[PDB]
Amino acid sequence: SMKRVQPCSLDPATQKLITNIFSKEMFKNTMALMDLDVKKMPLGKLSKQQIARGFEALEALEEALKGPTDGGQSLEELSSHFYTVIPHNFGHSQPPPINSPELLQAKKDMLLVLADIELAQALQAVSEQEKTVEEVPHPLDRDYQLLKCQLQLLDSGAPEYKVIQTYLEQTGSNHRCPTLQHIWKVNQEGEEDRFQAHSKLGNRKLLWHGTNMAVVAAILTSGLRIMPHSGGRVGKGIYFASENSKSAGYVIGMKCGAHHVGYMFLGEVALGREHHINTDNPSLKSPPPGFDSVIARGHTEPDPTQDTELELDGQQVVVPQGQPVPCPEFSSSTFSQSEYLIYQESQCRLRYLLEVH
Numbered sequence: 001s002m003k004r005v006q007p008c009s010l011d012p013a014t015q016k017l018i019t020n021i022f023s024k025e026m027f028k029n030t031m032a033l034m035d036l037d038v039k040k041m042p043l044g045k046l047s048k049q050q051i052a053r054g055f056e057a058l059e060a061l062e063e064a065l066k067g068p069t070d071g072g073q074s075l076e077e078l079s080s081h082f083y084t085v086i087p088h089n090f091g092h093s094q095p096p097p098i099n100s101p102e103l104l105q106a107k108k109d110m111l112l113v114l115a116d117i118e119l120a121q122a123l124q125a126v127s128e129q130e131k132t133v134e135e136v137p138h139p140l141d142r143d144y145q146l147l148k149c150q151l152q153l154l155d156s157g158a159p160e161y162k163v164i165q166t167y168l169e170q171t172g173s174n175h176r177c178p179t180l181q182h183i184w185k186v187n188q189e190g191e192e193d194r195f196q197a198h199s200k201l202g203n204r205k206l207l208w209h210g211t212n213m214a215v216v217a218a219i220l221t222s223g224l225r226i227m228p229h230s231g232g233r234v235g236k237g238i239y240f241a242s243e244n245s246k247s248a249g250y251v252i253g254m255k256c257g258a259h260h261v262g263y264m265f266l267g268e269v270a271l272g273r274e275h276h277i278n279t280d281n282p283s284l285k286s287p288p289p290g291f292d293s294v295i296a297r298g299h300t301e302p303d304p305t306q307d308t309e310l311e312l313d314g315q316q317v318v319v320p321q322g323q324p325v326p327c328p329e330f331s332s333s334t335f336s337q338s339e340y341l342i343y344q345e346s347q348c349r350l351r352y353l354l355e356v357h
């Protein structure tokens with residue numbers, strides 16, 4: 001007969017977060033923003049098979065792009081097949097040909113977001129145990145438990161609160177300053193074991209990772225990942241910034257009522273011996289031999305003399321506290337702001353999640 005729904009155990013802020021990151025409207029908004037046809041590709045219709053087939057179309061396009069003219073299919077023809085697999089919407093005009101490396105990576109980045117949307121759908125599937133029991137958790141407790149990631153809301157007087165607020169305020173944009181609403185301490189267990197492997201590795205820094213809302217659930221469940229087909233200015237790794245304003249550019253938020261809500265992570269990254277670069281290298285898949293990280297160095301860096309430390313699981317972790325200052329050694333760099341790169345998932349541990357407006 002009628003199953004009982006148990007009261008929610010979660011505080012209001014965490015309830016709102018959980019509502020936001022599993023929101024169907026949000027997921028569909030993200031798809032429409034990536035030019036996808038949500039009518040032809042419903043959320044409940046998304047499959048891993050479809051996404052794999054899309055990546056296979058992009059791989060064929062990549063091969064056609066990298067040359068030469070070998071008498072294969074045209075770029076228009078191979079685009080047309082991609083759009084059969086992954087329906088796009090451009091006001092019912094024909095979609096554009098995927099005919100440049102820039103556009104190709106954009107379609108790769110899109111499919112990676114769609115893969116993390118699919119993940120959140122699959123995660124929500126009702127299990128057979130859940131159908132037999134006569135009392136069920138509040139839907140938000142259920143969704144929270146699916147993450148298998150401990151979240152703890154921080155209050156104003158938490159040991160790290162002011163340190164994190166200062167990091168945000170001092171390294172964020174001077175005019176378009178993102179407003180802190182909430183901070184959660186993040187404990188994704190199953191990250192801990194692989195992270196402990198790097199315990200001898202010094203040079204740890206708390207670094208920003210801005211993200212769109214559509215991939216937050218996947219990150220909470222899985223950690224920050226190096227996905228096949230991922231890339232960027234410093235190659236195939238996980239990207240962090242010491243400047244909030246740099247990471248805030250990657251925060252795709254959503255309109256709530258009269259405000260715009262978005263999410264940013266702080267990860268503890270074991271950088272070890274750093275290799276500094278000053279020119280883009282999209283082909284990097286690891287640091288040079290003897291290095292543990294690659295730092296694309298910017299014209300500016302948060303004033304190192306203002307750096308502080310937090311103790312996280314018995315380790316000292318550098319947290320920038322200073323406004324960006326010019327670095328004369330990197331004044332001719334192709335990077336205005338630094339991008340911090342690691343090339344294995346175990347060198348980072350999620351530590352904090354911030355809600356910003």
Ligand SMILES: Cc1nc2c(c(=O)[nH]1)CSCC2
Nearest residue numbers: 209210239240241247250339
């Ligand atoms: C998704 C994401 N990308 C990057 C950053 C980020 O915070 N998020 C900062 S470095 C440049 C790339």
